[PDB]
Amino acid sequence: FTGLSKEELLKVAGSPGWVRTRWALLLLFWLGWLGMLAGAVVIIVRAPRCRELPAQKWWHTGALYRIGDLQAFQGHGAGNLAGLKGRLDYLSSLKVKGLVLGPIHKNQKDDVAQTDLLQIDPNFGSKEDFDSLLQSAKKKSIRVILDLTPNYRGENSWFSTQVDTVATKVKDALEFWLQAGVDGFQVRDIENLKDASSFLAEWQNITKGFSEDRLLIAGTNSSDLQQILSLLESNKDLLLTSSYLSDSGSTGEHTKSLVTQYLNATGNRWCSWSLSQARLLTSFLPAQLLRLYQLMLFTLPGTPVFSYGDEIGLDAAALPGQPMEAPVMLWDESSFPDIPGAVSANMTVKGQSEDPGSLLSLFRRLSDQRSKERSLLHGDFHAFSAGPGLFSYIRHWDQNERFLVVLNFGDVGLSAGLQASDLPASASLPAKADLLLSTQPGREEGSPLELERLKLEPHEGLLLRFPYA
Amino acid sequence: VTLQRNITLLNGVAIIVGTIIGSGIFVTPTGVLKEAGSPGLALVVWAACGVFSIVGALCYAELGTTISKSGGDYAYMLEVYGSLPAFLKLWIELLIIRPSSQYIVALVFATYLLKPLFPTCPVPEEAAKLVACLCVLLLTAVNCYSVKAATRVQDAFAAAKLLALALIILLGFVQIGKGDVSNLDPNFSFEGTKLDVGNIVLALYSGLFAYGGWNYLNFVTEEMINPYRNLPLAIIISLPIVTLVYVLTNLAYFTTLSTEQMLSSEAVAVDFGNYHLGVMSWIIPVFVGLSCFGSVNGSLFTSSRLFFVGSREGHLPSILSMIHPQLLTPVPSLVFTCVMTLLYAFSKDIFSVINFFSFFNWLCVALAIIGMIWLRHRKPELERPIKVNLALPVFFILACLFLIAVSFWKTPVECGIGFTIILSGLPVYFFGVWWKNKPKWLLQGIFSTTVLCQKLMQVVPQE
Numbered sequence: 001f002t003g004l005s006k007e008e009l010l011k012v013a014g015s016p017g018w019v020r021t022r023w024a025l026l027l028l029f030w031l032g033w034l035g036m037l038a039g040a041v042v043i044i045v046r047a048p049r050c051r052e053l054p055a056q057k058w059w060h061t062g063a064l065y066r067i068g069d070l071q072a073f074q075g076h077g078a079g080n081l082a083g084l085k086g087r088l089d090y091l092s093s094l095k096v097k098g099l100v101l102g103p104i105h106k107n108q109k110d111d112v113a114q115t116d117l118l119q120i121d122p123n124f125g126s127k128e129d130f131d132s133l134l135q136s137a138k139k140k141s142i143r144v145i146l147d148l149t150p151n152y153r154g155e156n157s158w159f160s161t162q163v164d165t166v167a168t169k170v171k172d173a174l175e176f177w178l179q180a181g182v183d184g185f186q187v188r189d190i191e192n193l194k195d196a197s198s199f200l201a202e203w204q205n206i207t208k209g210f211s212e213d214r215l216l217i218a219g220t221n222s223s224d225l226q227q228i229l230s231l232l233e234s235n236k237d238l239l240l241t242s243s244y245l246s247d248s249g250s251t252g253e254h255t256k257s258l259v260t261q262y263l264n265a266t267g268n269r270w271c272s273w274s275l276s277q278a279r280l281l282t283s284f285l286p287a288q289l290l291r292l293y294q295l296m297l298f299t300l301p302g303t304p305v306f307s308y309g310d311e312i313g314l315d316a317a318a319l320p321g322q323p324m325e326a327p328v329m330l331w332d333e334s335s336f337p338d339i340p341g342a343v344s345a346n347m348t349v350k351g352q353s354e355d356p357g358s359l360l361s362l363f364r365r366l367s368d369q370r371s372k373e374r375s376l377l378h379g380d381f382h383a384f385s386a387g388p389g390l391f392s393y394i395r396h397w398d399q400n401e402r403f404l405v406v407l408n409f410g411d412v413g414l415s416a417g418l419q420a421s422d423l424p425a426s427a428s429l430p431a432k433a434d435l436l437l438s439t440q441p442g443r444e445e446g447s448p449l450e451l452e453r454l455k456l457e458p459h460e461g462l463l464l465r466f467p468y469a
Numbered sequence: 470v471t472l473q474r475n476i477t478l479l480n481g482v483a484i485i486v487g488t489i490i491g492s493g494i495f496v497t498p499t500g501v502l503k504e505a506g507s508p509g510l511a512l513v514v515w516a517a518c519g520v521f522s523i524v525g526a527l528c529y530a531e532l533g534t535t536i537s538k539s540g541g542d543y544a545y546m547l548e549v550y551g552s553l554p555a556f557l558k559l560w561i562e563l564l565i566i567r568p569s570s571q572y573i574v575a576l577v578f579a580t581y582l583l584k585p586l587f588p589t590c591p592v593p594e595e596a597a598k599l600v601a602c603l604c605v606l607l608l609t610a611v612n613c614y615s616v617k618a619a620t621r622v623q624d625a626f627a628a629a630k631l632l633a634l635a636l637i638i639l640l641g642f643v644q645i646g647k648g649d650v651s652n653l654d655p656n657f658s659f660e661g662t663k664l665d666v667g668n669i670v671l672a673l674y675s676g677l678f679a680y681g682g683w684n685y686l687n688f689v690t691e692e693m694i695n696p697y698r699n700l701p702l703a704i705i706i707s708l709p710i711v712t713l714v715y716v717l718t719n720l721a722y723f724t725t726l727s728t729e730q731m732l733s734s735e736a737v738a739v740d741f742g743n744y745h746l747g748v749m750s751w752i753i754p755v756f757v758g759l760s761c762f763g764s765v766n767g768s769l770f771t772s773s774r775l776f777f778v779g780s781r782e783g784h785l786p787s788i789l790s791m792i793h794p795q796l797l798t799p800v801p802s803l804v805f806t807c808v809m810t811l812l813y814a815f816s817k818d819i820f821s822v823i824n825f826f827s828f829f830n831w832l833c834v835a836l837a838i839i840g841m842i843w844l845r846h847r848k849p850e851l852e853r854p855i856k857v858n859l860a861l862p863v864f865f866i867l868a869c870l871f872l873i874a875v876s877f878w879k880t881p882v883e884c885g886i887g888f889t890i891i892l893s894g895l896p897v898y899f900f901g902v903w904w905k906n907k908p909k910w911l912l913q914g915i916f917s918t919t920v921l922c923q924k925l926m927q928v929v930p931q932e
């Protein structure tokens with residue numbers, strides 16, 4: 001129908017000039033196929049292959065969490081080891097990866113003869129309670145780190161006596177506790193320990209000997225860069241928290257200089273960022289700077305360490321009669337029975353779990369962003385110059401979403417004034433970037449904005465995100 | 470001068486199993502996990518979805534026998550709804566539904582074949598398109614050569630898909646056999662409830678995606694040797710086994726990977742492969758890619774046949790029914806299909822068309838099932854095989870309607886845009902299907918073009 005019949009077509013399509021045409025077309029198609037294959041293989045070969053992952057351990061993937069006073073964490077009258085197992089959900093809300101419990105051994109005073117690191121103080125709990133806590137944490141994938149300090153209720157933390165016996169007993173305690181299943185250890189105030197470097201090296205060697213998934217934390221109170229670097233002259237896998245970033249912060253350039261000098265001197269290794277070893281953020285900063293530092297500590301190439309109550313801006317001096325070394329957590333308006341009515345609904349965890357304009361919500365968002373992207377996990381860090389009082393830096397791993405942080409430590413507004421031509425072309429910032437979040441309410445999110453006319457409000461931080469260039 | 474049966478029941482079972490198993494459970498198990506309830510609840514959802522699909526099968530198992538004509542979902546509604554709706558269906562079908570399907574499957578094949586050369590870094594975009602086009606062209610050439618080879622190719626690739634799924638099941642069971650709690654006891658931890666917008670319901674229109682393709686065998690009917698018993702037997706063999714395979718695969722994934730790990734991943738199959746097998750893990754991705762290969766073949770083996778149906782009625786140009794006299798393969802239809810797929814390759818992103826894919830196919834199925842009972846009422850005396858009652862389909866029909874609801878939830882504007890294509894296709898019908906009155910010049914040109922094409926590629930008409 002509407003075409004040549006079968007017999008006529010088979011009679012007419014046998015002459016030369018039509019079989020040759022079909023053969024030529026077949027040859028052309030089949031050669032074009034091989035040409036496309038060759039093009040595909042050339043495209044595949046001519047491309048950078050990839051960058052291999054650095055095989056991170058468990059403590060590279062998130063922020064730690066310290067607890068200096070177990071009894072005061074959930075209020076008086078309920079301080080016990082088994083009490084913690086009812087709180088991990090809240091901790092699981094913060095998506096932390098560690099839990100640095102306070103010292104729970106038997107130590108009444110500077111007495112040494114009968115101060116043991118192997119017996120749990122009955123005031124806290126029992127060995128079975130500790131085992132249950134560890135099992136529940138393992139089910140929740142929250143690693144537990146146990147503190148060890150011969151004196152935590154006295155004045156001097158090392159008995160002010162010959163350190164051989166305490167070194168031997170803590171060495172025995174390390175191997176005794178590693179059987180139970182602890183995932184690390186922490187020692188504080190090591191600056192008061194004679195011949196610290198040899199002891200730290202031996203302890204690190206012993207701890208790494210049991211497994212490759214164990215951690216050792218060392219804490220000092222000094223802030224001298226040379227002093228900090230001295231303790232690392234024989235150890236490179238130690239995490240040393242110290243008051244290096246404290247006693248300053250008034251000018252943005254000073255903090256930038258401190259961070260850059262520390263990274264240059266340490267040789268770009270894994271370090272831990274914290275404003276102190278056993279104190280909260282409010283003990284060194286005004287109430288208007290917590291958001292700025294909380295944004296700062298989540299985007300540094302390291303493992304942030306926070307003390308308990310630093311996600312709701314707890315203040316020791318805001319409530320009279322509360323010791324500054326152990327503030328009471330504010331779970332509700334009744335969390336402080338003494339002088340009731342002195343706590344508002346804004347300082348309570350339950351009062352901040354639903355308000356996006358609060359520290360806790362920002363804390364949760366930052367923690368979620370830190371433990372998810374590869375650039376914030378093992379990305380490369382590059383800081384470039386900007387205007388005075390500013391701190392701007394970039395994180396970029398290989399080919400993933402690049403992050404750009406801009407911070408205004410100054411008290412007055414100013415322009416951005418960012419400078420290019422000092423980063424590799426693979427890390428050059430684009431003209432327009434998105435805005436993942438801002439610590440100052442009054443701005444929109446998800447809107448790609450230009451970087452040429454960017455202005456910063458006093459004490460404001462920006463977390464722009466842009467894709468591969 | 471007409472194509473022969475050259476299909477047995479085993480080939481039909483292989484075709485349906487292969488076309489059901491596409492990317493499916495290999496790429497998107499995370500959805501139901503993070504869209505409704507808890508891990509354990511997800512184990513229920515898939516099963517429920519399977520029952521749904523099974524019910525739908527038991528409709529086409531009878532309707533297909535009712536009107537023994539090729540071109541499923543087109544010739545069946547050709548009778549009830551008249552001429553214009555059938556042509557509209559066929560036109561939008563060929564224009565969007567097929568090329569999207571072939572291109573998506575081919576692109577998935579290319580990506581999961583090229584993955585072992587770019588484990589963490591993303592695969593280059595240029596290479597994937599070229600590999601997909603090469604696969605499509607090679608499969609078109611193979612189908613055009615002889616259907617007999619394509620039958621064994623489809624059989625072998627369906628067997629390979631089943632073997633890969635069985636290996637996945639075996640590894641998932643062995644990683645439990647060593648002794649571990651594997652967090653299976655905690656269930657319904659964050660189940661919540663069905664929200665006002667819909668929480669448990671929200672997972673069904675994503676779970677049903679892997680269960681699609683249960684009517685491709687009805688496209689190439691009347692090419693089967695004694696379809697009367699073979700087609701229902703093929704359906705009954707195919708559906709329960711694939712449903713149980715999917716639910717067991719979901720169990721295997723849940724027993725080896727935590728919720729957080731699954732949420733923080735894109736390709737669950739790659740994680741499962743490199744987790745419990747380590748070196749030489751390339752077996753897991755490559756097989757997946759190989760699977761997609763067979764899938765593409767199946768699509769072609771249906772698509773061209775549908776076109777061969779259309780020109781029989783007159784809705785299509787007379788050339789798109791031509792047959793090579795010595796090789797039965799319908800060459801012009803295959804060339805048309807591959808050309809359409811390659812033209813569809815020129816896009817700007819993925820998933821831009823799949824959004825209304827469910828809307829289109831579900832509305833077509835719903836209209837077909839509605840027409841079934843009206844046809845039965847208007848003609849209650851027929852030689853149908855089971856004389857089954859309309860008890861089962863009616864409920865199914867209502868469920869179909871529910872889908873349109875969700876369809877007009879996410880992108881109603883995209884649906885409105887999609888309607889414009891069929892609205893512009895109405896003039897396509899009016900141009901040549903009905904307005905037979907044409908000037909002599911146009912008829913002469915059409916005849917000259919047709920005879921030129923027949924001279925170029927040796928094809929003789931069908932009788």
Ligand SMILES: *[C@@H]1O[C@H](CO)[C@@H](O[C@@H]2O[C@H](CO)[C@@H](O)[C@H](O)[C@H]2NC(C)=O)[C@H](O)[C@H]1NC(C)=O
Pocket residue numbers: 202205206209
């Ligand atoms: C561990 O400390 C010692 C002190 O010299 C050194 O290695 C010791 O001796 C051999 C050689 O490595 C090891 O098999 C022992 O296990 C080490 N003794 C320990 C644990 O102190 C070296 O300084 C360090 N090397 C290791 C193994 O970490």
Ligand SMILES: *[C@@H]1O[C@H](CO)[C@@H](O[C@@H]2O[C@H](CO)[C@@H](O)[C@H](O)[C@H]2NC(C)=O)[C@H](O)[C@H]1NC(C)=O
Pocket residue numbers: 192221222223224
């Ligand atoms: C760290 O804390 C100690 C105690 O407050 C500071 O003072 C030292 O105290 C010990 C006694 O425990 C003395 O033996 C030292 O001589 C004191 N140090 C100095 C420099 O005199 C110590 O100064 C603190 N560290 C820093 C860097 O301030």
Ligand SMILES: *[C@@H]1O[C@H](CO)[C@@H](O[C@@H]2O[C@H](CO)[C@@H](O)[C@H](O)[C@H]2NC(C)=O)[C@H](O)[C@H]1NC(C)=O
Pocket residue numbers: 264265
């Ligand atoms: C780390 O910074 C130091 C300190 O600037 C640099 O080492 C040399 O330091 C002296 C004194 O400042 C100067 O000669 C230069 O600043 C440095 N020498 C060079 C680089 O020519 C150095 O830039 C950085 N790298 C290290 C680890 O030395």
Ligand SMILES: *[C@@H]1O[C@H](CO)[C@@H](O[C@@H]2O[C@H](CO)[C@@H](O)[C@H](O)[C@H]2NC(C)=O)[C@H](O)[C@H]1NC(C)=O
Pocket residue numbers: 344345346347
């Ligand atoms: C939570 O809300 C109460 C009620 O306003 C705050 O109490 C105010 O404290 C601010 C400084 O924080 C003072 O300027 C006001 O005089 C107080 N107003 C009243 C009516 O009490 C409470 O301080 C708020 N929380 C914080 C720390 O800002």
Ligand SMILES: N[C@@H](Cc1ccc(O)c(O)c1)C(=O)O
Pocket residue numbers: 488489490491492493494678679680681682683830
């Ligand atoms: N079911 C195919 C993909 C697919 C095939 C056919 C369909 O009709 C459909 O909607 C979707 C798969 O498992 O990957």
